[PDB]
Amino acid sequence: SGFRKMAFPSGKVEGCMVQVTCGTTTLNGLWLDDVVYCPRHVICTSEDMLNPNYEDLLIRKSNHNFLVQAGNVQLRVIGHSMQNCVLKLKVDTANPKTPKYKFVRIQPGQTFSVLACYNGSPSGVYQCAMRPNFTIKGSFLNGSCGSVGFNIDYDCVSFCYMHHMELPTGVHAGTDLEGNFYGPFVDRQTAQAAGTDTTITVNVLAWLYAAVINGDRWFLNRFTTTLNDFNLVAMKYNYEPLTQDHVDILGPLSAQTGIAVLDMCASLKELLQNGMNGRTILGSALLEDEFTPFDVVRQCS
Amino acid sequence: SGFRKMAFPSGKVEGCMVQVTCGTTTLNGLWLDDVVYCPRHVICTSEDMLNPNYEDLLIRKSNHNFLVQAGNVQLRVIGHSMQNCVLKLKVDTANPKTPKYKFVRIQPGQTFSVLACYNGSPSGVYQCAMRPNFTIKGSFLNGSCGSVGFNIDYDCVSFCYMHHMELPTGVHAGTDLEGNFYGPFVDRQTAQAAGTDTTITVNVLAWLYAAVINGDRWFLNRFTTTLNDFNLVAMKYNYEPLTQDHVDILGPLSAQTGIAVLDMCASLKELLQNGMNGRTILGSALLEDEFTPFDVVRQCS
Ligand SMILES: *[C@H](O)[C@H](C[C@@H]1CCNC1=O)NC(=O)[C@H](CC(C)C)NC(=O)OCc1cccc(Cl)c1
Ligand SMILES: *[C@H](O)[C@H](C[C@@H]1CCNC1=O)NC(=O)[C@H](CC(C)C)NC(=O)OCc1cccc(Cl)c1
Ligand SMILES: [Mg+2]
Ligand SMILES: [Mg+2]
């Protein structure tokens, strides 16, 4: 037993991280087969970062402008192109460590593991949720751009995030692996703010089921609510509406614990209205919303 | 910026995990050079688990009693021995993926990454602290034994934990890689309880420094206390005494923030006496004690 925020094992992605240097800017790239993927702002300078015209900047580059280091071995760049906000560098060597993989664009509320890297060298692994406002609450310093987020599904790595920037509130923004930002953000050093966020209701309910499976039961009650009455409470406390799709997704956890979804909603309602009164749930004094139903099932059996 | 509970990248350890099966019992083993390390209770049966005599059980085994699977490839066992609570199985094939490594026995309060595995197959990675009562708060199901805990120090893996069992409070117990339990525990299915735990004071202070580095300052105050006055507060709230060694270890964080250690102690004293009053620190409504000073420095720069 026990319930912990858990990342996927990172080895399959570690074997794909390289260093990309263009001028005085160095960040990370993702080496899959004979292509390296990295944020296109590697081709900016200090003065371009206000509002760069990236098509102009790339027309002015040649293959020799791009230094790609895979460990100690230098990879020779034989081609370059731009797709949305990602640069694709064709190299003469196919990565022998390329896992089975796919590129996925995730929905808000879904989680993924981040392999934080600097200078092409992985430094740590942690779990993130895509917030409803399309930011993530990560841990990224200068040089971390090009670090990727992923899930693993039977030795197939699904890449879903590449890191590009930090917002003024300290949260983080980036793209799918085709270079499309999550959210309304753009890759220039300007005044961009995260919109107001909301709490991921279906994940909170999943985490309450994790708590029951692990023996935390003090928040349960005999009452059951209706979906409409519950959603009126959710809106008052800045929680996302609960849909019937979410109810169905919580099916297996409801059946394993014998607690109907709308029964667990009545517990959540009372936790929101009355708080915890000095008690904790799975070691937390706040309601946690960064565990999906899949995350709970994967860990709780 | 940002501060997250972060594990070490797990690839170097993933390449070392194998499956060990003895009879109807299967757990995980650690394959380094031509030796596999695993918990010795793999040689028990259902009825032995009450109070087994392990030297008798091992004298009755032969090499062919041990099935060792490295992925699909079966490793042939050419020798077996017992060291404290670990079994060592000599195999005919040296692991080509053996990292640079060492075995370390850690002190309470230190942290490490756990690579949870089932059937020799890694499933997740997360961070743990060795509690003062020599348990860890992990996430382990049946079949997880032999999963290891480790730190990485410039591509050298220091192994410090091998998992053996779960206690009745839901916390976890195991050994160093030489087979010596952390704490007073023994590897049989009996009535063992974790002793009363305490909070790791030096880690809480490190985490308050992480919070300041990341812009959380609301808990600071002008006051400074003495080490003796602070330790009187620590004892009242079941915190470990703060030593001058801990003060020195917090030196670099004190210098980076300009906040003297005894100044931060006065903030901790007020947080303990008055609580948070609905505010949070680094996203937490409780004081966190599973980040070492090294963990904070590694992430905060
Ligand atoms: C790429 O490595 C970097 C990641 C940032 C650096 C600090 N935390 C991060 O996540 N991204 C940028 O520097 C980005 C480049 C623009 C052109 C998209 N700009 C940016 O994040 O500016 C905000 C910022 C906040 C704090 C510190 C810095 Cl250096 C930058
Ligand atoms: C080894 O895989 C297993 C790990 C346990 C299983 C449940 N969580 C864990 O961490 N260890 C044992 O089963 C151990 C064997 C003895 C001989 C040391 N006994 C044990 O943990 O018993 C306690 C227990 C609690 C909950 C569930 C189970 Cl199956 C066992
Ligand atoms: Mg109820
Ligand atoms: Mg002070």
XYZ file of C-alpha atoms and ligand atoms in Angstrom:
664
model
C 0.000 0.000 0.000
C 0.816 3.704 0.100
C 0.177 6.408 -2.467
C 2.946 8.565 -3.890
C 3.323 10.999 -6.741
C 5.160 8.719 -9.142
C 6.914 9.362 -12.447
C 7.449 6.870 -15.233
C 10.934 5.315 -15.371
C 12.951 7.706 -17.510
C 15.581 5.511 -19.183
C 13.915 5.314 -22.590
C 13.870 9.131 -22.768
C 17.330 9.614 -21.254
C 18.743 7.836 -24.296
C 17.188 10.515 -26.524
C 18.425 13.752 -24.915
C 21.122 15.777 -26.690
C 22.554 19.277 -26.446
C 21.788 21.821 -29.173
C 23.924 24.961 -29.344
C 23.355 27.836 -31.776
C 25.639 30.809 -31.230
C 25.727 31.593 -27.515
C 22.407 29.840 -26.767
C 22.380 26.217 -25.634
C 19.336 24.108 -24.783
C 18.182 20.493 -25.023
C 16.988 18.478 -27.982
C 15.185 15.191 -28.489
C 16.966 12.758 -30.826
C 14.592 10.273 -32.487
C 15.822 8.251 -35.480
C 17.835 10.781 -37.558
C 16.004 13.948 -36.405
C 16.626 16.222 -33.409
C 13.660 18.245 -32.111
C 14.212 21.412 -30.075
C 12.593 24.803 -29.389
C 13.051 27.173 -32.261
C 14.083 30.034 -29.973
C 17.564 28.462 -29.937
C 18.139 30.577 -33.069
C 17.412 33.870 -31.278
C 19.925 36.287 -29.804
C 19.513 38.525 -26.765
C 18.056 41.354 -28.849
C 15.806 39.172 -31.021
C 13.920 37.866 -27.974
C 11.544 40.859 -27.810
C 9.651 40.010 -31.014
C 11.709 37.837 -33.377
C 10.775 37.014 -36.955
C 11.708 33.352 -36.940
C 11.382 32.681 -40.677
C 13.994 35.395 -41.311
C 16.285 34.039 -38.602
C 16.165 30.507 -40.017
C 16.773 31.558 -43.616
C 20.011 33.139 -42.316
C 21.250 29.921 -40.682
C 23.135 27.034 -42.259
C 23.665 23.478 -41.036
C 27.067 24.415 -39.577
C 25.422 26.992 -37.288
C 23.963 24.106 -35.220
C 26.169 22.194 -32.766
C 24.536 18.932 -31.644
C 26.281 16.908 -28.923
C 25.131 13.392 -28.011
C 27.219 12.795 -24.910
C 30.752 13.385 -26.161
C 30.024 12.483 -29.788
C 29.184 15.402 -32.055
C 26.323 14.748 -34.458
C 26.674 16.389 -37.852
C 23.598 18.351 -38.936
C 22.645 17.600 -42.557
C 19.373 19.542 -42.750
C 17.163 21.955 -40.813
C 13.523 23.019 -40.891
C 10.871 24.638 -38.716
C 7.442 23.262 -37.761
C 5.382 25.734 -35.718
C 7.554 26.515 -32.669
C 9.925 23.514 -32.975
C 13.115 23.277 -34.994
C 13.875 19.946 -36.673
C 17.557 19.176 -37.292
C 18.274 16.235 -39.578
C 21.481 14.472 -38.513
C 23.613 11.911 -40.328
C 23.276 9.328 -37.514
C 20.065 7.594 -36.488
C 19.733 7.275 -32.716
C 20.372 3.588 -31.901
C 18.474 4.078 -28.625
C 15.268 5.342 -30.259
C 12.357 3.776 -28.337
C 9.023 2.895 -29.792
C 7.303 6.268 -29.598
C 4.462 8.539 -30.612
C 3.648 12.237 -30.361
C 0.442 13.061 -28.454
C -1.294 16.378 -27.754
C -2.895 16.013 -24.326
C -6.074 17.533 -22.799
C -6.048 19.692 -19.662
C -6.247 17.574 -16.537
C -3.961 14.848 -17.898
C -0.605 14.143 -16.262
C 2.847 13.311 -17.569
C 6.413 12.802 -16.404
C 8.961 15.563 -17.017
C 12.626 14.668 -17.502
C 14.384 17.895 -16.607
C 17.667 18.274 -18.496
C 20.532 20.726 -18.752
C 23.225 20.639 -21.457
C 21.711 17.449 -22.839
C 22.182 15.748 -19.459
C 19.110 14.577 -17.500
C 19.003 15.872 -13.932
C 15.660 14.783 -12.469
C 12.210 13.376 -13.068
C 8.864 14.504 -11.729
C 5.133 14.404 -12.417
C 3.091 17.338 -13.817
C -0.551 17.950 -14.729
C -1.605 20.110 -17.657
C -3.623 22.750 -15.788
C -6.990 23.961 -17.169
C -5.217 27.247 -18.024
C -2.615 25.284 -20.056
C 0.365 25.896 -17.788
C 2.284 23.376 -15.727
C 3.691 23.797 -12.227
C 7.201 22.567 -12.909
C 10.780 23.127 -11.800
C 12.810 24.640 -14.629
C 15.904 26.841 -14.632
C 17.722 28.579 -17.454
C 18.979 25.957 -19.888
C 16.047 23.585 -19.297
C 14.272 24.361 -22.570
C 13.805 21.330 -24.761
C 13.209 19.091 -21.750
C 10.239 16.864 -22.573
C 7.162 15.470 -20.884
C 5.944 11.968 -21.633
C 3.894 8.934 -20.641
C 4.888 5.300 -21.164
C 2.369 2.717 -22.417
C 3.899 -0.789 -22.598
C 7.398 0.353 -23.638
C 5.934 2.892 -26.105
C 6.886 6.437 -25.106
C 4.184 9.020 -25.864
C 5.807 12.459 -25.908
C 3.380 15.254 -25.078
C 5.325 18.330 -23.928
C 8.472 20.249 -24.797
C 9.505 23.059 -22.458
C 9.843 26.641 -23.742
C 9.378 29.288 -21.040
C 8.424 30.496 -17.562
C 5.568 32.927 -16.891
C 5.687 35.765 -14.334
C 3.717 33.761 -11.753
C 6.467 31.121 -11.774
C 4.501 28.516 -13.771
C 5.631 27.038 -17.074
C 4.503 26.909 -20.696
C 5.472 24.925 -23.749
C 4.404 22.957 -26.787
C 3.435 19.566 -28.076
C 6.176 17.835 -30.064
C 4.783 19.272 -33.277
C 5.547 22.732 -31.879
C 2.018 23.969 -31.072
C 1.790 25.767 -27.731
C -0.568 24.591 -25.083
C -2.652 27.661 -24.326
C -2.511 31.084 -25.975
C 1.216 31.609 -25.417
C 3.877 32.592 -27.964
C 7.654 32.098 -27.904
C 8.948 35.593 -27.351
C 10.089 37.443 -24.222
C 7.020 39.600 -23.682
C 4.283 40.305 -21.125
C 2.297 37.063 -21.050
C 0.218 35.970 -18.079
C -1.480 32.716 -17.199
C -5.238 33.029 -17.097
C -7.142 32.236 -13.939
C -6.893 28.547 -13.173
C -9.485 26.100 -11.839
C -9.306 22.859 -9.854
C -9.529 19.547 -11.730
C -12.623 17.999 -10.131
C -12.378 14.506 -11.630
C -8.797 14.229 -10.368
C -9.751 15.293 -6.833
C -12.409 12.581 -6.816
C -9.888 10.021 -8.096
C -7.550 10.989 -5.248
C -10.335 10.580 -2.681
C -10.783 7.042 -4.038
C -7.037 6.469 -3.691
C -7.401 7.595 -0.091
C -10.218 5.117 0.591
C -8.277 2.273 -1.038
C -5.400 3.169 1.307
C -7.521 3.333 4.474
C -8.349 7.056 4.802
C -12.104 7.050 5.416
C -12.815 9.895 7.860
C -14.225 12.193 5.145
C -16.918 9.753 3.989
C -20.592 10.212 4.835
C -23.937 8.523 4.254
C -25.226 11.241 1.906
C -25.538 11.192 -1.874
C -25.991 14.253 -4.072
C -27.115 14.835 -7.646
C -24.787 15.836 -10.457
C -26.581 19.184 -10.853
C -26.477 20.029 -7.142
C -22.804 19.076 -7.007
C -21.871 21.251 -9.986
C -23.478 24.244 -8.270
C -21.022 23.678 -5.413
C -18.118 23.180 -7.831
C -18.744 26.546 -9.487
C -18.781 28.337 -6.122
C -15.362 26.892 -5.208
C -13.756 27.321 -8.665
C -13.876 23.617 -9.527
C -14.426 22.393 -13.059
C -17.894 21.005 -13.830
C -18.205 17.238 -13.454
C -19.458 15.541 -16.613
C -21.066 12.157 -17.143
C -17.918 11.215 -19.053
C -15.938 11.829 -15.845
C -18.462 9.795 -13.851
C -17.957 6.851 -16.215
C -14.157 7.214 -16.110
C -14.384 6.899 -12.313
C -16.373 3.664 -12.739
C -13.630 1.140 -11.918
C -12.586 3.037 -8.782
C -16.214 3.344 -7.690
C -16.675 -0.413 -8.143
C -13.462 -1.346 -6.321
C -14.428 0.692 -3.245
C -18.196 0.207 -3.482
C -18.656 3.988 -3.234
C -20.828 5.492 -5.972
C -19.382 8.543 -7.719
C -22.236 10.775 -6.570
C -21.665 9.437 -3.046
C -18.035 10.569 -3.188
C -19.247 13.922 -4.550
C -21.180 14.450 -1.316
C -17.960 13.956 0.664
C -16.144 16.449 -1.568
C -18.979 18.950 -1.070
C -18.579 18.709 2.704
C -14.780 19.004 2.487
C -15.168 22.178 0.419
C -17.757 23.723 2.746
C -16.139 22.737 6.061
C -12.462 22.065 5.373
C -10.464 19.303 7.024
C -10.394 20.527 10.658
C -6.738 19.678 11.211
C -6.931 16.244 9.573
C -5.041 15.057 6.501
C -5.811 12.899 3.474
C -2.944 10.777 2.137
C -0.529 13.072 3.946
C -1.998 16.285 2.522
C -3.831 19.139 4.222
C -5.194 20.351 0.853
C -7.316 18.607 -1.763
C -4.937 17.286 -4.459
C -5.927 17.474 -8.124
C -2.859 16.256 -10.065
C -3.699 12.530 -10.036
C -5.823 11.206 -12.875
C -8.125 8.193 -12.453
C -5.584 6.259 -14.535
C -2.782 7.354 -12.185
C -4.745 6.033 -9.204
C -5.602 2.688 -10.810
C -2.001 2.204 -11.959
C -0.780 2.573 -8.380
C -3.733 1.177 -6.364
C -4.413 -2.534 -6.870
C 12.073 28.582 -10.892
C 9.640 26.276 -9.113
C 10.282 23.570 -6.549
C 9.162 19.986 -7.043
C 9.808 16.667 -5.380
C 12.231 15.262 -7.928
C 13.728 11.805 -8.401
C 17.020 10.987 -10.061
C 16.756 9.755 -13.666
C 16.310 6.005 -13.353
C 17.858 4.585 -16.534
C 21.114 3.407 -14.974
C 19.131 1.343 -12.441
C 16.500 0.144 -14.917
C 19.273 -1.699 -16.739
C 20.000 -3.661 -13.548
C 16.547 -4.981 -12.582
C 15.791 -8.686 -13.062
C 13.146 -11.137 -11.897
C 14.042 -13.792 -9.321
C 11.659 -16.719 -8.864
C 12.080 -19.466 -6.259
C 9.200 -21.924 -6.113
C 5.945 -19.968 -6.147
C 7.539 -16.722 -4.892
C 8.723 -14.100 -7.368
C 10.342 -10.757 -6.563
C 12.949 -8.400 -8.012
C 16.717 -8.611 -8.044
C 19.572 -6.235 -8.759
C 22.052 -7.488 -11.373
C 25.527 -5.956 -10.991
C 28.465 -7.539 -12.840
C 27.897 -11.319 -12.442
C 25.912 -11.186 -9.162
C 22.175 -10.765 -8.537
C 21.123 -9.312 -5.168
C 17.633 -9.936 -3.789
C 15.798 -10.339 -0.462
C 16.466 -13.684 1.102
C 12.787 -14.254 1.889
C 12.403 -15.362 -1.745
C 13.368 -18.809 -0.402
C 10.443 -18.942 2.050
C 7.097 -20.638 1.543
C 3.714 -19.594 2.914
C 4.213 -21.594 6.110
C 7.858 -20.619 6.661
C 6.972 -16.915 6.836
C 6.020 -17.028 10.539
C 9.568 -17.610 11.820
C 11.824 -19.170 9.170
C 15.298 -20.545 9.797
C 17.001 -19.164 6.719
C 20.294 -21.059 7.009
C 18.327 -24.332 6.893
C 16.241 -23.153 3.947
C 19.317 -22.178 1.926
C 21.214 -25.396 2.615
C 18.208 -27.178 1.046
C 18.341 -25.147 -2.181
C 20.467 -25.731 -5.266
C 21.348 -23.395 -8.128
C 18.525 -24.832 -10.260
C 15.952 -23.760 -7.648
C 16.530 -20.113 -8.692
C 14.975 -18.764 -11.902
C 16.534 -15.438 -12.939
C 15.005 -13.601 -15.910
C 16.692 -10.549 -17.447
C 13.960 -9.395 -19.800
C 13.316 -12.484 -21.905
C 16.798 -13.965 -21.477
C 17.166 -16.475 -18.663
C 20.347 -16.099 -16.631
C 21.852 -19.345 -15.394
C 22.660 -19.345 -11.674
C 26.133 -20.774 -10.982
C 26.353 -20.076 -7.242
C 24.336 -18.832 -4.269
C 25.091 -17.399 -0.838
C 23.495 -15.344 1.922
C 24.763 -12.098 3.478
C 22.581 -10.900 6.363
C 19.088 -10.539 4.849
C 20.153 -10.510 1.163
C 20.668 -13.479 -1.123
C 23.519 -13.272 -3.639
C 23.108 -15.331 -6.819
C 26.210 -15.694 -8.972
C 25.259 -15.883 -12.657
C 27.295 -16.927 -15.685
C 26.746 -13.579 -17.470
C 28.084 -10.223 -16.319
C 25.551 -7.426 -16.763
C 26.772 -5.349 -19.739
C 24.714 -2.416 -18.419
C 26.370 -2.339 -14.984
C 26.835 1.343 -14.064
C 29.600 2.716 -11.948
C 28.182 2.059 -8.495
C 28.680 1.814 -4.760
C 26.715 0.520 -1.783
C 25.962 3.122 0.911
C 24.200 2.831 4.276
C 22.401 6.138 4.798
C 21.534 8.118 7.973
C 17.966 9.023 8.950
C 16.876 12.257 7.323
C 18.608 11.506 4.015
C 16.586 11.059 0.830
C 16.807 8.712 -2.130
C 14.953 7.739 -5.284
C 12.967 4.492 -5.326
C 12.531 2.593 -8.592
C 9.435 0.525 -7.932
C 9.477 -2.731 -9.905
C 7.283 -5.764 -10.430
C 8.406 -8.978 -12.158
C 11.760 -7.380 -12.915
C 10.008 -4.572 -14.806
C 10.282 -0.979 -13.515
C 6.921 0.726 -13.052
C 7.617 4.105 -11.440
C 10.075 6.371 -9.689
C 9.627 8.525 -6.620
C 11.522 10.213 -3.798
C 11.657 8.929 -0.183
C 13.291 10.054 3.063
C 14.654 7.627 5.631
C 12.493 8.603 8.617
C 14.046 8.961 12.106
C 12.224 5.718 13.018
C 13.922 3.960 10.054
C 10.822 3.451 7.925
C 10.004 5.020 4.586
C 6.645 6.288 3.354
C 6.599 4.521 0.011
C 4.186 2.952 -2.453
C 4.743 -0.799 -2.630
C 2.419 -3.667 -3.522
C 2.920 -7.411 -3.394
C 5.764 -8.337 -5.725
C 7.685 -5.090 -5.141
C 10.336 -6.624 -2.885
C 13.837 -6.219 -4.220
C 13.041 -2.774 -5.613
C 15.955 -0.499 -4.725
C 16.557 3.036 -3.539
C 19.507 5.040 -4.801
C 21.183 8.397 -5.360
C 23.253 9.380 -8.397
C 26.528 11.309 -8.022
C 28.079 12.149 -11.421
C 26.981 8.931 -13.171
C 27.932 6.835 -10.108
C 24.866 5.119 -8.650
C 24.950 4.801 -4.850
C 22.487 2.089 -3.830
C 21.164 2.538 -0.304
C 17.894 0.608 0.086
C 16.358 -2.705 -0.917
C 12.669 -3.216 -0.170
C 11.511 -6.090 2.066
C 8.172 -5.445 3.785
C 5.227 -3.280 4.837
C 4.379 -2.506 8.470
C 0.834 -2.380 9.893
C 0.716 1.430 9.738
C 1.232 1.246 5.965
C 4.880 2.394 6.007
C 7.782 0.384 4.624
C 10.970 -1.270 5.853
C 14.025 -2.766 4.232
C 17.781 -3.124 4.147
C 20.985 -1.667 2.839
C 22.471 -3.592 -0.084
C 24.572 -5.642 2.306
C 21.320 -6.950 3.798
C 21.275 -5.095 7.144
C 17.847 -3.729 8.052
C 17.354 -0.086 8.716
C 15.810 -0.018 12.174
C 15.085 -2.936 14.501
C 13.052 -4.926 11.975
C 13.470 -8.573 10.944
C 12.362 -10.388 7.783
C 9.537 -12.559 9.010
C 5.752 -12.122 8.952
C 5.230 -11.172 12.584
C 3.890 -8.349 14.766
C 6.347 -5.515 14.141
C 5.467 -1.862 14.609
C 7.226 1.339 13.658
C 8.307 3.342 16.666
C 7.057 6.865 17.174
C 8.454 9.129 14.495
C 9.739 12.707 14.679
C 9.997 15.570 12.186
C 13.332 16.189 10.447
C 14.095 19.754 11.556
C 17.083 20.450 9.300
C 15.021 19.413 6.272
C 12.113 21.689 7.223
C 14.558 24.586 7.454
C 16.053 23.671 4.067
C 12.549 23.713 2.576
C 11.839 27.145 4.069
C 14.991 28.344 2.284
C 13.723 26.772 -0.942
C 10.523 28.730 -0.401
C 12.394 32.026 0.016
C 14.516 31.355 -3.076
C 11.237 30.807 -4.954
C 9.522 33.962 -3.664
C 7.491 32.713 -0.669
C 8.366 35.211 2.064
C 5.195 35.723 4.129
C 6.448 33.561 7.026
C 9.633 35.576 7.611
C 10.044 37.940 10.556
C 12.609 40.304 12.044
C 13.309 38.096 15.076
C 16.282 35.842 15.764
C 16.382 33.087 18.373
C 19.135 31.095 20.053
C 19.859 27.454 19.318
C 18.922 26.468 22.887
C 15.630 28.381 22.880
C 14.759 26.910 19.490
C 15.449 23.332 20.584
C 13.059 23.796 23.510
C 10.362 24.571 20.934
C 11.424 21.637 18.744
C 11.008 19.173 21.610
C 7.498 20.451 22.367
C 6.407 19.882 18.748
C 8.191 16.521 18.267
C 10.948 17.942 16.064
C 14.475 16.590 16.137
C 17.058 18.744 17.936
C 18.991 21.108 15.677
C 22.752 20.637 15.922
C 25.609 22.939 15.000
C 26.451 20.429 12.274
C 23.000 21.087 10.775
C 23.535 24.842 11.091
C 26.774 24.548 9.107
C 25.145 22.306 6.479
C 22.554 25.059 5.956
C 25.385 27.566 5.403
C 25.206 27.871 1.603
C 21.426 28.343 1.648
C 21.721 30.919 4.427
C 24.322 32.823 2.393
C 22.338 32.693 -0.855
C 19.235 34.175 0.795
C 21.019 36.377 3.337
C 18.885 34.841 6.103
C 20.868 33.499 9.060
C 19.963 29.981 10.181
C 18.866 31.168 13.621
C 16.767 33.826 11.871
C 14.955 31.122 9.902
C 14.534 29.182 13.162
C 12.499 32.087 14.538
C 10.148 31.829 11.548
C 9.787 28.078 12.091
C 9.021 28.692 15.776
C 6.183 31.042 14.833
C 4.834 28.627 12.204
C 4.751 25.861 14.820
C 3.061 28.018 17.465
C 0.551 29.775 15.186
C 0.139 27.623 12.080
C -0.264 29.006 8.577
C -3.699 30.692 8.851
C -4.936 29.448 5.488
C -1.721 30.268 3.615
C 0.576 27.833 1.823
C 4.324 27.414 1.389
C 5.496 26.042 -1.965
C 2.001 24.681 -2.521
C 1.795 22.917 0.849
C -0.423 23.568 3.857
C 1.910 21.517 6.098
C 5.598 21.906 6.895
C 7.514 19.511 4.601
C 10.509 17.588 5.937
C 11.557 15.246 3.095
C 13.913 17.659 1.304
C 17.535 17.687 2.402
C 19.718 20.804 2.120
C 21.458 19.034 -0.773
C 18.091 18.428 -2.466
C 17.288 22.141 -2.234
C 20.665 23.306 -3.556
C 20.520 20.800 -6.423
C 17.197 22.250 -7.559
C 17.512 25.929 -6.510
C 20.205 27.899 -8.342
C 14.746 28.063 -21.864
O 15.773 27.324 -21.257
C 14.136 29.040 -20.862
C 13.453 28.288 -19.717
C 13.049 29.329 -18.624
C 14.261 29.935 -18.034
C 13.827 30.220 -16.595
N 12.742 29.155 -16.336
C 12.310 28.655 -17.497
O 11.468 27.814 -17.626
N 13.161 29.860 -21.557
C 13.312 31.177 -21.694
O 14.267 31.760 -21.240
C 12.231 31.939 -22.454
C 12.792 32.277 -23.837
C 11.701 32.987 -24.633
C 12.315 33.475 -25.945
C 10.540 32.035 -24.921
N 11.868 33.169 -21.767
C 11.465 33.166 -20.493
O 11.141 32.150 -19.950
O 11.443 34.321 -19.846
C 10.923 34.321 -18.547
C 12.009 34.069 -17.498
C 11.655 33.991 -16.155
C 12.626 33.758 -15.187
C 13.955 33.603 -15.560
C 14.310 33.682 -16.902
Cl 15.925 33.493 -17.356
C 13.340 33.913 -17.872
C 7.571 -8.344 -0.930
O 7.165 -8.142 -2.257
C 6.490 -7.858 0.033
C 6.293 -6.346 -0.090
C 5.036 -5.948 0.747
C 3.825 -6.556 0.156
C 2.741 -5.527 0.481
N 3.526 -4.203 0.571
C 4.829 -4.457 0.719
O 5.694 -3.635 0.822
N 6.899 -8.189 1.385
C 6.212 -9.042 2.145
O 5.209 -9.582 1.748
C 6.741 -9.326 3.547
C 7.390 -10.711 3.524
C 7.977 -10.985 4.905
C 8.471 -12.432 4.930
C 9.136 -10.032 5.195
N 5.667 -9.313 4.529
C 4.856 -8.260 4.665
O 5.131 -7.201 4.179
O 3.734 -8.425 5.348
C 2.944 -7.291 5.571
C 1.913 -7.087 4.459
C 1.074 -5.978 4.500
C 0.134 -5.771 3.496
C 0.029 -6.675 2.448
C 0.866 -7.785 2.405
Cl 0.740 -8.884 1.130
C 1.809 -7.992 3.407
Mg -21.145 10.215 0.791
Mg 13.271 35.623 11.493
